[PDB]
Every structure is written in C-alpha cells, then in structure tokens.
mmCIF file of all heavy atoms in Angstrom:
data_model
loop_
_atom_site.group_PDB
_atom_site.id
_atom_site.type_symbol
_atom_site.label_atom_id
_atom_site.label_comp_id
_atom_site.label_asym_id
_atom_site.label_seq_id
_atom_site.Cartn_x
_atom_site.Cartn_y
_atom_site.Cartn_z
ATOM 1 N N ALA A 135 37.550 138.115 107.570
ATOM 2 C CA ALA A 135 38.665 137.790 108.494
ATOM 3 C C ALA A 135 39.935 137.403 107.706
ATOM 4 O O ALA A 135 41.025 137.670 108.180
ATOM 5 C CB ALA A 135 38.234 136.685 109.455
ATOM 6 N N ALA A 136 39.778 136.799 106.540
ATOM 7 C CA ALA A 136 40.811 136.009 105.854
ATOM 8 C C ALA A 136 42.016 136.887 105.520
ATOM 9 O O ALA A 136 43.107 136.337 105.452
ATOM 10 C CB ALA A 136 40.267 135.389 104.608
ATOM 11 N N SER A 137 41.837 138.194 105.342
ATOM 12 C CA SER A 137 42.949 139.086 104.914
ATOM 13 C C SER A 137 43.499 139.944 106.070
ATOM 14 O O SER A 137 44.437 140.728 105.833
ATOM 15 C CB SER A 137 42.489 139.921 103.757
ATOM 16 O OG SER A 137 41.543 140.895 104.155
ATOM 17 N N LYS A 138 42.997 139.778 107.283
ATOM 18 C CA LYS A 138 43.331 140.586 108.489
ATOM 19 C C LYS A 138 44.505 139.925 109.237
ATOM 20 O O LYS A 138 44.535 138.695 109.349
ATOM 21 C CB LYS A 138 42.076 140.716 109.374
ATOM 22 C CG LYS A 138 40.904 141.416 108.698
ATOM 23 C CD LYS A 138 41.008 142.967 108.689
ATOM 24 C CE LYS A 138 39.799 143.685 108.137
ATOM 25 N NZ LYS A 138 39.640 143.418 106.689
ATOM 26 N N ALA A 139 45.433 140.714 109.763
ATOM 27 C CA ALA A 139 46.626 140.184 110.456
ATOM 28 C C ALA A 139 46.185 139.243 111.578
ATOM 29 O O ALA A 139 46.876 138.261 111.826
ATOM 30 C CB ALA A 139 47.509 141.292 110.990
ATOM 31 N N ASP A 140 45.084 139.583 112.254
ATOM 32 C CA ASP A 140 44.561 138.788 113.404
ATOM 33 C C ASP A 140 43.336 137.955 112.995
ATOM 34 O O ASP A 140 42.581 137.497 113.908
ATOM 35 C CB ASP A 140 44.242 139.703 114.579
ATOM 36 C CG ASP A 140 43.214 140.770 114.276
ATOM 37 O OD1 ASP A 140 42.721 140.804 113.147
ATOM 38 O OD2 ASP A 140 42.879 141.533 115.208
ATOM 39 N N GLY A 141 43.105 137.757 111.712
ATOM 40 C CA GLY A 141 41.867 137.112 111.228
ATOM 41 C C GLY A 141 41.792 135.603 111.413
ATOM 42 O O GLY A 141 40.647 135.094 111.647
ATOM 43 N N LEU A 142 42.909 134.880 111.315
ATOM 44 C CA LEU A 142 42.946 133.420 111.193
ATOM 45 C C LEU A 142 43.878 132.796 112.212
ATOM 46 O O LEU A 142 44.891 133.412 112.614
ATOM 47 C CB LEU A 142 43.330 132.960 109.788
ATOM 48 C CG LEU A 142 42.484 133.511 108.641
ATOM 49 C CD1 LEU A 142 43.034 133.015 107.313
ATOM 50 C CD2 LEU A 142 40.995 133.195 108.797
ATOM 51 N N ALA A 143 43.554 131.549 112.546
ATOM 52 C CA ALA A 143 44.337 130.711 113.451
ATOM 53 C C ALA A 143 44.298 129.283 112.923
ATOM 54 O O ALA A 143 43.195 128.750 112.561
ATOM 55 C CB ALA A 143 43.857 130.819 114.888
ATOM 56 N N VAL A 144 45.454 128.657 112.921
ATOM 57 C CA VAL A 144 45.599 127.250 112.488
ATOM 58 C C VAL A 144 46.379 126.470 113.556
ATOM 59 O O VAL A 144 47.444 126.914 113.983
ATOM 60 C CB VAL A 144 46.273 127.091 111.116
ATOM 61 C CG1 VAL A 144 46.422 125.627 110.804
ATOM 62 C CG2 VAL A 144 45.557 127.807 109.999
ATOM 63 N N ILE A 145 45.793 125.365 114.049
ATOM 64 C CA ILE A 145 46.551 124.341 114.806
ATOM 65 C C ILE A 145 47.138 123.404 113.760
ATOM 66 O O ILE A 145 46.364 122.773 113.030
ATOM 67 C CB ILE A 145 45.645 123.571 115.790
ATOM 68 C CG1 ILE A 145 45.032 124.513 116.812
ATOM 69 C CG2 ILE A 145 46.442 122.469 116.476
ATOM 70 C CD1 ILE A 145 43.980 123.826 117.682
ATOM 71 N N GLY A 146 48.466 123.341 113.671
ATOM 72 C CA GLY A 146 49.159 122.325 112.870
ATOM 73 C C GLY A 146 49.703 121.196 113.724
ATOM 74 O O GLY A 146 50.321 121.433 114.798
ATOM 75 N N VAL A 147 49.492 119.988 113.237
ATOM 76 C CA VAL A 147 49.997 118.744 113.856
ATOM 77 C C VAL A 147 50.849 117.985 112.825
ATOM 78 O O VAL A 147 50.360 117.656 111.739
ATOM 79 C CB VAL A 147 48.834 117.878 114.370
ATOM 80 C CG1 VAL A 147 49.387 116.690 115.139
ATOM 81 C CG2 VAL A 147 47.859 118.723 115.206
ATOM 82 N N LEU A 148 52.116 117.762 113.157
ATOM 83 C CA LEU A 148 53.007 116.929 112.332
ATOM 84 C C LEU A 148 52.573 115.480 112.432
ATOM 85 O O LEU A 148 52.286 115.007 113.583
ATOM 86 C CB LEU A 148 54.447 117.154 112.787
ATOM 87 C CG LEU A 148 54.901 118.595 112.556
ATOM 88 C CD1 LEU A 148 56.079 118.938 113.414
ATOM 89 C CD2 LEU A 148 55.169 118.828 111.088
ATOM 90 N N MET A 149 52.495 114.831 111.281
ATOM 91 C CA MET A 149 52.127 113.411 111.162
ATOM 92 C C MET A 149 53.330 112.529 110.816
ATOM 93 O O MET A 149 53.935 112.711 109.738
ATOM 94 C CB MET A 149 50.956 113.248 110.182
ATOM 95 C CG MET A 149 49.712 114.051 110.625
ATOM 96 S SD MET A 149 48.361 114.132 109.448
ATOM 97 C CE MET A 149 47.997 112.404 109.230
ATOM 98 N N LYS A 150 53.671 111.631 111.749
ATOM 99 C CA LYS A 150 54.859 110.753 111.646
ATOM 100 C C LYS A 150 54.433 109.375 111.136
ATOM 101 O O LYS A 150 53.588 108.731 111.780
ATOM 102 C CB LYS A 150 55.627 110.602 112.956
ATOM 103 C CG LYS A 150 56.967 109.868 112.773
ATOM 104 C CD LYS A 150 57.823 109.753 114.008
ATOM 105 C CE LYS A 150 57.144 109.012 115.150
ATOM 106 N NZ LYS A 150 57.111 107.536 114.968
ATOM 107 N N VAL A 151 54.991 108.919 110.019
ATOM 108 C CA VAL A 151 54.685 107.570 109.447
ATOM 109 C C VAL A 151 55.046 106.488 110.481
ATOM 110 O O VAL A 151 56.124 106.557 111.118
ATOM 111 C CB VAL A 151 55.349 107.360 108.071
ATOM 112 C CG1 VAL A 151 56.864 107.265 108.141
ATOM 113 C CG2 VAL A 151 54.773 106.166 107.333
ATOM 114 N N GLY A 152 54.113 105.566 110.705
ATOM 115 C CA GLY A 152 54.271 104.437 111.634
ATOM 116 C C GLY A 152 52.972 103.645 111.682
ATOM 117 O O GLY A 152 52.435 103.281 110.601
ATOM 118 N N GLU A 153 52.462 103.440 112.894
ATOM 119 C CA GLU A 153 51.203 102.715 113.192
ATOM 120 C C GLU A 153 50.027 103.444 112.519
ATOM 121 O O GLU A 153 49.915 104.717 112.589
ATOM 122 C CB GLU A 153 50.976 102.673 114.713
ATOM 123 C CG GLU A 153 51.932 101.790 115.475
ATOM 124 C CD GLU A 153 51.731 100.309 115.223
ATOM 125 O OE1 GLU A 153 50.662 99.781 115.616
ATOM 126 O OE2 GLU A 153 52.632 99.692 114.631
ATOM 127 N N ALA A 154 49.116 102.674 111.965
ATOM 128 C CA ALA A 154 47.808 103.178 111.496
ATOM 129 C C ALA A 154 47.143 103.966 112.630
ATOM 130 O O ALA A 154 47.311 103.603 113.785
ATOM 131 C CB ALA A 154 46.968 102.041 110.983
ATOM 132 N N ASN A 155 46.482 105.066 112.283
ATOM 133 C CA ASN A 155 45.844 105.982 113.240
ATOM 134 C C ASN A 155 44.352 105.710 113.142
ATOM 135 O O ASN A 155 43.713 106.144 112.192
ATOM 136 C CB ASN A 155 46.144 107.441 112.930
ATOM 137 C CG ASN A 155 45.711 108.375 114.030
ATOM 138 O OD1 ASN A 155 44.714 108.108 114.714
ATOM 139 N ND2 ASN A 155 46.440 109.462 114.208
ATOM 140 N N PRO A 156 43.759 104.936 114.074
ATOM 141 C CA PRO A 156 42.319 104.669 113.990
ATOM 142 C C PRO A 156 41.439 105.944 114.016
ATOM 143 O O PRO A 156 40.340 105.882 113.469
ATOM 144 C CB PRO A 156 42.080 103.735 115.196
ATOM 145 C CG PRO A 156 43.258 103.967 116.130
ATOM 146 C CD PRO A 156 44.419 104.290 115.218
ATOM 147 N N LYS A 157 41.902 107.061 114.614
ATOM 148 C CA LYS A 157 41.116 108.334 114.698
ATOM 149 C C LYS A 157 40.888 108.920 113.290
ATOM 150 O O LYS A 157 39.929 109.710 113.139
ATOM 151 C CB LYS A 157 41.773 109.433 115.549
ATOM 152 C CG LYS A 157 42.359 109.034 116.898
ATOM 153 C CD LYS A 157 41.411 109.133 118.055
ATOM 154 C CE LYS A 157 42.113 109.386 119.380
ATOM 155 N NZ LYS A 157 41.443 108.664 120.482
ATOM 156 N N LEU A 158 41.729 108.591 112.297
ATOM 157 C CA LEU A 158 41.545 109.052 110.902
ATOM 158 C C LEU A 158 40.440 108.295 110.170
ATOM 159 O O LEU A 158 40.149 108.727 109.047
ATOM 160 C CB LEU A 158 42.837 108.822 110.126
ATOM 161 C CG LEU A 158 43.956 109.794 110.431
ATOM 162 C CD1 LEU A 158 45.233 109.343 109.750
ATOM 163 C CD2 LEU A 158 43.601 111.195 109.987
ATOM 164 N N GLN A 159 39.865 107.222 110.748
ATOM 165 C CA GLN A 159 39.059 106.230 110.003
ATOM 166 C C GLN A 159 37.836 106.879 109.356
ATOM 167 O O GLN A 159 37.613 106.594 108.149
ATOM 168 C CB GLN A 159 38.585 105.074 110.889
ATOM 169 C CG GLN A 159 37.948 103.949 110.081
ATOM 170 C CD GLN A 159 39.006 103.297 109.222
ATOM 171 O OE1 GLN A 159 40.014 102.834 109.737
ATOM 172 N NE2 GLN A 159 38.808 103.285 107.914
ATOM 173 N N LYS A 160 37.063 107.686 110.098
ATOM 174 C CA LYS A 160 35.803 108.256 109.564
ATOM 175 C C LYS A 160 36.201 109.073 108.349
ATOM 176 O O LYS A 160 35.505 109.003 107.323
ATOM 177 C CB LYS A 160 35.024 109.100 110.570
ATOM 178 C CG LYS A 160 33.645 109.559 110.082
ATOM 179 C CD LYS A 160 33.116 110.779 110.844
ATOM 180 C CE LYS A 160 32.002 111.505 110.130
ATOM 181 N NZ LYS A 160 30.783 110.693 110.139
ATOM 182 N N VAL A 161 37.333 109.771 108.443
ATOM 183 C CA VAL A 161 37.769 110.658 107.332
ATOM 184 C C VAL A 161 38.125 109.809 106.116
ATOM 185 O O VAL A 161 37.625 110.122 105.003
ATOM 186 C CB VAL A 161 38.924 111.575 107.720
ATOM 187 C CG1 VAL A 161 39.371 112.379 106.504
ATOM 188 C CG2 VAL A 161 38.562 112.471 108.884
ATOM 189 N N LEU A 162 39.008 108.833 106.294
ATOM 190 C CA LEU A 162 39.469 107.977 105.179
ATOM 191 C C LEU A 162 38.276 107.260 104.549
ATOM 192 O O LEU A 162 38.228 107.230 103.331
ATOM 193 C CB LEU A 162 40.509 107.008 105.720
ATOM 194 C CG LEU A 162 41.791 107.678 106.215
ATOM 195 C CD1 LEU A 162 42.672 106.687 106.990
ATOM 196 C CD2 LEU A 162 42.538 108.336 105.065
ATOM 197 N N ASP A 163 37.333 106.738 105.357
ATOM 198 C CA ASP A 163 36.129 106.024 104.853
ATOM 199 C C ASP A 163 35.364 106.949 103.897
ATOM 200 O O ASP A 163 34.772 106.409 102.937
ATOM 201 C CB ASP A 163 35.235 105.500 105.994
ATOM 202 C CG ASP A 163 35.796 104.324 106.791
ATOM 203 O OD1 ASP A 163 36.885 103.826 106.425
ATOM 204 O OD2 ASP A 163 35.137 103.896 107.768
ATOM 205 N N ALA A 164 35.381 108.276 104.123
ATOM 206 C CA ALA A 164 34.548 109.257 103.380
ATOM 207 C C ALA A 164 35.112 109.519 101.975
ATOM 208 O O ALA A 164 34.338 109.978 101.144
ATOM 209 C CB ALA A 164 34.359 110.553 104.162
ATOM 210 N N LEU A 165 36.400 109.257 101.726
ATOM 211 C CA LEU A 165 37.071 109.714 100.472
ATOM 212 C C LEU A 165 36.503 108.989 99.246
ATOM 213 O O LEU A 165 36.590 109.567 98.133
ATOM 214 C CB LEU A 165 38.571 109.465 100.570
ATOM 215 C CG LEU A 165 39.278 110.223 101.692
ATOM 216 C CD1 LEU A 165 40.740 109.841 101.773
ATOM 217 C CD2 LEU A 165 39.123 111.723 101.515
ATOM 218 N N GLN A 166 36.000 107.749 99.419
ATOM 219 C CA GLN A 166 35.381 106.944 98.316
ATOM 220 C C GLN A 166 34.182 107.697 97.694
ATOM 221 O O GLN A 166 33.864 107.398 96.517
ATOM 222 C CB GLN A 166 34.975 105.518 98.723
ATOM 223 C CG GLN A 166 34.128 105.411 99.993
ATOM 224 C CD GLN A 166 32.738 106.004 99.895
ATOM 225 O OE1 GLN A 166 32.054 105.885 98.869
ATOM 226 N NE2 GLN A 166 32.289 106.634 100.978
ATOM 227 N N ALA A 167 33.546 108.648 98.406
ATOM 228 C CA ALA A 167 32.376 109.435 97.900
ATOM 229 C C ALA A 167 32.806 110.749 97.209
ATOM 230 O O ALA A 167 31.945 111.378 96.573
ATOM 231 C CB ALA A 167 31.402 109.710 99.028
ATOM 232 N N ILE A 168 34.088 111.157 97.315
ATOM 233 C CA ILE A 168 34.573 112.444 96.718
ATOM 234 C C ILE A 168 35.857 112.175 95.936
ATOM 235 O O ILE A 168 36.828 112.964 96.090
ATOM 236 C CB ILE A 168 34.777 113.539 97.785
ATOM 237 C CG1 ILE A 168 35.800 113.122 98.848
ATOM 238 C CG2 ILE A 168 33.422 113.935 98.386
ATOM 239 C CD1 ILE A 168 36.593 114.252 99.403
ATOM 240 N N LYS A 169 35.863 111.113 95.144
ATOM 241 C CA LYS A 169 37.088 110.620 94.459
ATOM 242 C C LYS A 169 37.663 111.665 93.501
ATOM 243 O O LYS A 169 38.896 111.709 93.404
ATOM 244 C CB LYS A 169 36.838 109.302 93.718
ATOM 245 C CG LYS A 169 37.239 108.077 94.515
ATOM 246 C CD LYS A 169 38.758 107.893 94.605
ATOM 247 C CE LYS A 169 39.119 106.785 95.561
ATOM 248 N NZ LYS A 169 40.453 107.013 96.142
ATOM 249 N N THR A 170 36.836 112.438 92.818
ATOM 250 C CA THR A 170 37.250 113.352 91.719
ATOM 251 C C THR A 170 36.913 114.802 92.082
ATOM 252 O O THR A 170 35.976 115.049 92.932
ATOM 253 C CB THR A 170 36.633 112.955 90.368
ATOM 254 O OG1 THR A 170 35.223 112.816 90.496
ATOM 255 C CG2 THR A 170 37.195 111.655 89.833
ATOM 256 N N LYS A 171 37.620 115.738 91.438
ATOM 257 C CA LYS A 171 37.477 117.190 91.657
ATOM 258 C C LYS A 171 36.030 117.665 91.518
ATOM 259 O O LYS A 171 35.429 117.422 90.449
ATOM 260 C CB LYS A 171 38.209 117.974 90.585
ATOM 261 C CG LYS A 171 38.267 119.450 90.900
ATOM 262 C CD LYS A 171 39.278 120.174 90.053
ATOM 263 C CE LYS A 171 39.343 121.643 90.426
ATOM 264 N NZ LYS A 171 40.441 122.379 89.746
ATOM 265 N N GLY A 172 35.553 118.455 92.481
ATOM 266 C CA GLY A 172 34.177 118.979 92.452
ATOM 267 C C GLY A 172 33.224 118.098 93.231
ATOM 268 O O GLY A 172 32.139 118.587 93.599
#
C-alpha cells in the first residue's frame, strides 16, 4: 500500500501548548521502557 496514490491515510491533530493532556498518560508512562534507539 505504502507506494500507491490511494494506499495511505493519516489523521493529523495539531497540539497546542497549555494544560497537561491526561489522555497522553499511558503513552508518556511507556517511554521509560524505550529510552534508547532499538
């Protein structure tokens, strides 16, 4: 699919600096386990 004109779709959401986003928490909590490349 990756090289086809109709192969891919991306929802982009602009992120505005302000209040902490609690919905990001599970993601941010996970980064301590993948600190370095690979």
Side-chain angles (χ1 to χ4, degrees):
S137 71
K138 299 280 185 293
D140 59 1
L142 305 177
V144 178
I145 299 172
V147 186
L148 296 160
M149 301 172 59
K150 189 176 60 76
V151 68
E153 290 290 294
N155 190 328
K157 315 269 208 217
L158 285 172
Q159 189 67 56
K160 187 201 162 70
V161 176
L162 295 169
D163 289 356
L165 298 176
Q166 51 67 39
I168 60 148
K169 264 287 172 207
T170 52
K171 189 165 182 173

